Amino acid sequence: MENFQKVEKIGEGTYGVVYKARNKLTGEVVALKKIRTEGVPSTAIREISLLKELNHPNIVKLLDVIHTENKLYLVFEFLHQDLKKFMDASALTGIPLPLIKSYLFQLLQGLAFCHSHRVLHRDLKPQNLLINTEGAIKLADFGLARAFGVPVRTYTHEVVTLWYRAPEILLGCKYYSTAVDIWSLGCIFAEMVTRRALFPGDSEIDQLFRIFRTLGTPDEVVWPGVTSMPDYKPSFPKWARQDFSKVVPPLDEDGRSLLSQMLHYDPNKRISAKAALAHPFFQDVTKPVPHLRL
Ligand SMILES: Nc1nc(N)nc(-c2cc(O)ccc2O)n1
């Protein structure tokens, strides 16, 4: 692109590298993502284009889609910091509960909007949740996984995180439901509260086994159909479920209650974003302003 001027590289997504750029025209500063391949799929540039209409205050706005020279550039609004960075910065002290509750509340509104438009994220994680000084938090990279498909690593040599991957995906399901996003968000919710990733797997089986060790190895009782899943093995060790009081202390009972419904094994039983918004946990929700040092 000749219009912009790569101010800085603000990260390396799984679908390409993201740059902060100043538009020599509008002068506006935006986030410029260079996607990945012999010319980029055509069904892809059509799916992505549809997301320009998926506008919501809790969804990073996709300003433009430019397919040129068999290269794909996505232009997004720019936010100054991602949640992973804010958590690392807040670890010594921990993000205050009121601000954790506000972010979760906003993320669920974002998901509710996307899910109502039959759009799933599929790859939610702290690194693509963006915050601003006004206390807002927004979902980035929505719909990208759909158009494309998470490969071995990423666009290039660099491991993709599995820490937030729903169990049905790890067990080989072919069709993903909106429930996969709820699972990811529950994982992020727990990480904000405890200041440590909930299920930091370093391999697919390790990821699954970390989930089993904490929530109990799933069976036909809690998850009808699970033993019929593609990657399910009768040889999986049988671990007992641990109490949530031990999983996310010292989170209160409303919080633990909501988290438990967000981490139900059966995707059909997992709480929807719409319903999570009505949970007693958000009875006293407010919108605190974060402390960002840009
Ligand atoms: N890691 C990181 N940091 C910052 N500050 N921003 C972004 C960002 C990522 C996107 O995909 C879109 C817009 C953005 O502002 N990503």
Structure description:
This protein has 294 residues and is α+β, with helices and mostly antiparallel strands. The chain folds into two domains: 1-80, 2-Layer Sandwich (Phosphorylase Kinase, domain 1), CATH 3.30.200.20; 81-291, Transferase(Phosphotransferase) domain 1 (Transferase(Phosphotransferase), domain 1, Orthogonal Bundle), CATH 1.10.510. 30% of the residues lie in helices and 15% in strands. Bound molecules: 2-(4,6-diamino-1,3,5-triazin-2-yl)benzene-1,4-diol. Residues 10-11, 18, 31, 33, 60, 76, 78-82, 127, 130, 140-141 line the site of 2-(4,6-diamino-1,3,5-triazin-2-yl)benzene-1,4-diol (X66). Mg(2+) binds at residues 128, 141. The modification N6-acetyllysine is found at residue 6.
Write the layout of secondary structure elements.
Elements: E1 6-13, E2 16-22, E3 29-35, H1 44-50, E4 62-68, E5 71-77, E6 81-82, H2 83-90, H3 97-116, E7 129-131, E8 137-139, H4 144-147, H5 167-170, H6 179-194, H7 204-215, H8 244-247, H9 253-262, H10 273-276
Antiparallel strand pairs: 1-2, 2-3, 3-5, 4-5, 6-7, 7-8
2-(4,6-diamino-1,3,5-triazin-2-yl)benzene-1,4-diol (X66) binds at residues 10-11, 18, 31, 33, 60, 76, 78-82, 127, 130, 140-141.
